[PDB]
Amino acid sequence: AQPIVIKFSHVVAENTPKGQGALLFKKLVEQRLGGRVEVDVYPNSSLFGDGKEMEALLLGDVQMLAPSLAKFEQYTRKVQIFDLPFLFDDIQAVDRFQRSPQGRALLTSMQGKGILGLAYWHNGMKQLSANRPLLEPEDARGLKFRVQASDVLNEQFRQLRAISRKMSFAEVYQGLQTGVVNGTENTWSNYESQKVNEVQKYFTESNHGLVDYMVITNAKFWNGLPADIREELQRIMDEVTVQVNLEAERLNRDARQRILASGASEIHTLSPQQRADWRQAMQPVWQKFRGNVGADLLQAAEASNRP
Ligand SMILES: C/C(=C\C(=O)O)C(=O)O
Ligand SMILES: [Cl-]
Ligand SMILES: [Mg+2]
Numbered sequence: 001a002q003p004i005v006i007k008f009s010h011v012v013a014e015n016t017p018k019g020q021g022a023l024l025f026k027k028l029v030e031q032r033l034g035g036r037v038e039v040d041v042y043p044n045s046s047l048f049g050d051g052k053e054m055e056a057l058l059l060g061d062v063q064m065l066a067p068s069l070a071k072f073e074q075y076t077r078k079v080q081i082f083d084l085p086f087l088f089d090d091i092q093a094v095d096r097f098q099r100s101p102q103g104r105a106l107l108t109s110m111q112g113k114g115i116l117g118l119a120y121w122h123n124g125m126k127q128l129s130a131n132r133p134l135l136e137p138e139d140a141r142g143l144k145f146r147v148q149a150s151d152v153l154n155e156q157f158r159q160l161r162a163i164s165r166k167m168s169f170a171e172v173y174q175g176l177q178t179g180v181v182n183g184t185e186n187t188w189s190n191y192e193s194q195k196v197n198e199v200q201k202y203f204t205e206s207n208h209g210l211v212d213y214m215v216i217t218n219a220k221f222w223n224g225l226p227a228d229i230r231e232e233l234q235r236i237m238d239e240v241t242v243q244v245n246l247e248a249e250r251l252n253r254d255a256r257q258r259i260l261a262s263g264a265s266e267i268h269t270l271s272p273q274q275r276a277d278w279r280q281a282m283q284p285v286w287q288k289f290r291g292n293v294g295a296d297l298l299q300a301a302e303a304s305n306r307p
């Protein structure tokens with residue numbers, strides 16, 4: 001009789017990899033478990049936004065989240081590895097890293113704080129945007145970039161002699177519109193779904209980092225479920241993860257196409273030489289975090305680039 005409630009809060013639009021994943025998890029759970037588990041999905045920060053969502057998870061005011069891997073520094077300093085620029089060539093590489101023993105272990109890295117990782121969901125690679133062309137690294141100097149609340153990402157832009165402003169995802173469009181910030185970094189999906197292309201005249205397809213998610217829950221809640229239900233929820237989560245990874249690839253592509261079709265933002269692609277120039281300018285930031293992430297994680301992550 002007593003329905004089990006899973007409030008699943010996230011900050012993105014519905015027509016995105018995570019937005020679709022949350023909705024699919026709801027659909028499959030409600031259909032397969034016959035209503036014993038209810039999943040209430042809250043997109044676009046409608047329940048909780050960045051930062052506040054984690055506070056809520058610890059207090060039991062929400063049961064499921066899927067934050068960007070860049071937003072966990074207050075819970076563990078190991079997951080920061082995912083934010084290092086140019087560490088992963090593409091999503092295939094980060095996937096290999098995530099499936100390694102160390103990558104699997106990161107799902108438990110916050111267990112001591114009451115947070116359990118259930119899955120990794122892909123979004124895509126990060127691009128650069130601004131209201132001026134970003135062709136070479138010197139072009140970023142003196143600009144104000146919005147970043148996720150991440151020490152690594154702050155330092156990434158400081159390394160370029162740019163200014164970083166940590167701001168919640170909900171506030172990016174207005175920040176750029178009103179000039180609080182000049183540029184940012186994100187996946188095509190996030191840019192187009194929030195209409196940020198309307199307030200950014202230039203994009204550079206840098207693929208200089210990535211956005212992936214860790215699906216997380218409150219340990220007390222998850223462990224308090226009947227074992228048969230918990231195990232089935234995890235199997236369903238595994239099926240949803242497969243679907244999300246598919247949605248991510250095509251949704252990012254479609255978003256890029258929509259931005260290009262507007263004919264009101266330009267997209268600059270880089271030659272290998274041009275991308276290497278950006279890499280040379282940004283890679284020194286790794287020095288500031290190699291202690292936190294550790295030699296082993298770095299080695300494993302770099303090795304993921306070799307099939
Ligand atoms: C990557 C971000 C959000 C998200 O959840 O996709 C962000 O830029 O805040
Ligand atoms: Cl937000
Ligand atoms: Mg219902």
Ligand SMILES: [Mg+2]
Nearest residue numbers: 044045170171
């Ligand atoms: Mg909004």
